[PDB]
């Protein structure tokens, strides 16, 4: 067990508990199509952290071509990092239909 692993654990557990808590309440109210549509993209987004000189800190793979920057945080980070939140373009494509 390492710090990196414990940090991943904390994100995972955040998401697990949110998903389970939500379902406990919404299952009767929303249809299956509704709840499944709600969770389709949940958690799929990631932050690309770019350092102050343009060097990407976040590990990325070839997938990135199919992702779209949805939200941006700039000028807030004390090391001059830029944070971009990227989600599947497929989500926007399905919304448009």
Task: Output the six-digit token pair for 79.
Answer: 């090391």
Give the CB-side neighbour count of residue 11, counting CA atoms within 13 A.
10
Structure tokens at 70: 């949805």
The secondary structure element, H or E, covering residue 1 is: none
Residues 31-60 that bind its own copies (CB under 8 A): 32, 34-47, 49, 51, 57-59
Report yes or no: 68 and 92 within 8 Å, Cβ to Cβ.
yes
46 binds K ion (CB under 5 A): yes
Footprint of its own copies (CB under 8 A): 1-9, 11-17, 19-27, 29-30, 32, 34-47, 49, 51, 57-59, 61-63, 66, 70-71, 73, 76-79, 81, 83, 85, 87-88, 90-91, 95
Footprint of K ion (CB under 5 A): 46
């Amino acid at each position: 067990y390492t710090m990196q692993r414990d940090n991943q654990k904390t994100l995972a557990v955040y998401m697990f508990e949110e998903i389970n808590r939500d379902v406990e309440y919404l299952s009767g109210r929303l249809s299956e199509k509704e709840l499944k549509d709600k969770y389709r993209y949940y958690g799929r987004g990631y932050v690309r952290i770019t350092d102050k000189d343009g060097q990407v800190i976040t590990y990325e793979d070839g997938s990135v071509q199919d992702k779209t920057v949805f939200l941006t945080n700039e000028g807030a980070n004390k090391l001059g990092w830029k944070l971009e939140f990227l989600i599947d373009e497929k989500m926007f494509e399905e919304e448009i239909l």
